[PDB]
Amino acid sequence: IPTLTIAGSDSSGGAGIQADLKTFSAIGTYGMSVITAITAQNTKGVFAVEDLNKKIIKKQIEAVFEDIPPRAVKIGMVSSPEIILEIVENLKKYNPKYLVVDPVMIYLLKPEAKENLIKYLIPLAYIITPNIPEAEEITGIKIHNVDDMKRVGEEILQLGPKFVLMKGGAVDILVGKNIFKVYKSGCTLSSAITSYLALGYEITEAVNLSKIYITEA
Amino acid sequence: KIPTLTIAGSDSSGGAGIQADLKTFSAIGTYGMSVITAITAQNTKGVFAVEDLNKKIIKKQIEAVFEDIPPRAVKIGMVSSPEIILEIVENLKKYNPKYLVVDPVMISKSGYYLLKPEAKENLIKYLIPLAYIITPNIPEAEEITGIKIHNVDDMKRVGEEILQLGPKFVLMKGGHLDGEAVDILVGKNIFKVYKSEGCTLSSAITSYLALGYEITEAVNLSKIYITEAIK
């Protein structure tokens, strides 16, 4: 059961494709990756961030989808607006069943990248997993309490995602058309959801298990 | 939370390189980190693109990892650029990790060289001598020493020649010979024979060393891991 992560590389192993692959491995899906950028960083700071060229990113995408296609795909932090479009164009070509978009912005974000994320990537998401500042950047609405989290979440549903998991911080909320759930509370969570959706779990359930998974880790 | 580092190329299909290493690390229980040296677009049907990263971003990745909470064991996987091999060696001498597991990937199961002459020369002359343990197949052991291997006695003698070059231990993987397949562990004062079976074996050895097992038990547990993985 293949699950793909499309994100940057983090040398510390705390985020990016490393964190996603570790999670896929622990949960039991077969991990695959398209690396979009290389970052040298640790708990003390970022030493360097370097985008990969678009043709090597394209080749990675073709290699993954054209052999054993992934059941579910996670998109993490992609800072290049051009790389975001490249990702969108190819996702529409292969149409993986479940797309999990984690709009990572931490503060590192380009206005044009924000624009592409919102206009083109988000509407394709089965589920989007923004934290509070990401939900604010996306909608331009302040978030003060859970009522504002719920409401901003419903504003985000209007952009196309089938579900929104808003991460507070302290509670998280899952909103969908006929679904509202509160969870007493990052990259691990969205990769964990990707794996459970790929394994055939229903969305509320996949989120249940992902939280439980995090506790142990 | 025991950190283990892998320094190797990325394989999009997730069957090799850092992806395979990170999967093993995670399954065994160590905290995986990686210095990526190259980007490869490939799958079971073939290799579509390979791109070496620049020296500077490799250097920065290494510095980042060693300047915070460093790894308790380090695996070096396949590195195809001669220049990157030298930079990895210079950085490894600066940080001096205790458990350096070098998987000297040079020749495939199918019998093809996987590195050009200069890369191979740099790996053999400068990286291999820093290893705590190396995990060559028979063709690789032959390549390292220039000595032909026809049986297990030869495996042992060539393993011992390899120790004089710097590694404290050699785990020579069998399978290549026409005869009986066995894996042999050789150190200055140990010789042990194991059942024969890759990336998983070297990455699993890295994890068990980091977890606090001495080499012989680390190898032992790695083999049990593989057996359990195969089912």
UniProtKB/TrEMBL annotation, chain A:
Catalytic reactions on record: 4-amino-2-methyl-5-(phosphooxymethyl)pyrimidine + ATP = 4-amino-2-methyl-5-(diphosphooxymethyl)pyrimidine + ADP; 4-amino-5-hydroxymethyl-2-methylpyrimidine + ATP = 4-amino-2-methyl-5-(phosphooxymethyl)pyrimidine + ADP + H(+)
Transmembrane segments: none
Domain of life according to the entry: Bacteria
Span of domain Pyridoxamine kinase/Phosphomethylpyrimidine kinase: 10-217
CC annotations in GO: cytosol
SUPFAM superfamilies: Ribokinase-like
Alphabetical GO biological process terms: thiamine biosynthetic process
Keywords: ATP-binding, Kinase, Nucleotide-binding, Thiamine biosynthesis, Transferase
Record NCBIfam families: HMP-P_kinase (TIGR00097)
Protein name stated in the entry: Hydroxymethylpyrimidine/phosphomethylpyrimidine kinase
Lineage: Bacteria, Bacillati, Bacillota, Clostridia, Peptostreptococcales
UniProtKB/TrEMBL annotation, chain B:
Residue ranges annotated for the Pyridoxamine kinase/Phosphomethylpyrimidine kinase domain, each copy included: 11-231
EC numbers for this chain: 2.7.1.49, 2.7.4.7
Enzyme's top EC category: transferase
InterPro entries documented for this protein: HMP/HMP-P_kinase_dom, PM/HMP-P_kinase-1, Ribokinase-like
Biochemical pathway: Cofactor biosynthesis; thiamine diphosphate biosynthesis; 4-amino-2-methyl-5-diphosphomethylpyrimidine from 5-amino-1-(5-phospho-D-ribosyl)imidazole: step 3/3; Cofactor biosynthesis; thiamine diphosphate biosynthesis; 4-amino-2-methyl-5-diphosphomethylpyrimidine from 5-amino-1-(5-phospho-D-ribosyl)imidazole: step 2/3
Keyword ATP-binding among UniProt keywords: yes
One cellular-component annotation, GO: cytosol
The organism's place on the tree of life at top rank: Bacteria
One GO-annotated biological process of the protein: thiamine biosynthetic process
CDD domains from the UniProt entry: HMPP_kinase
Keywords: ATP-binding, Kinase, Nucleotide-binding, Thiamine biosynthesis, Transferase
PANTHER family: HYDROXYMETHYLPYRIMIDINE_PHOSPHOMETHYLPYRIMIDINE KINASE THI20-RELATED, PHOSPHOMETHYLPYRIMIDINE KINASE
Family: Belongs to the ThiD family.
Name of the protein: Hydroxymethylpyrimidine/phosphomethylpyrimidine kinase
Organism expressing this protein natively: Clostridioides difficile (strain 630) (Peptoclostridium difficile)
Gene: thiD
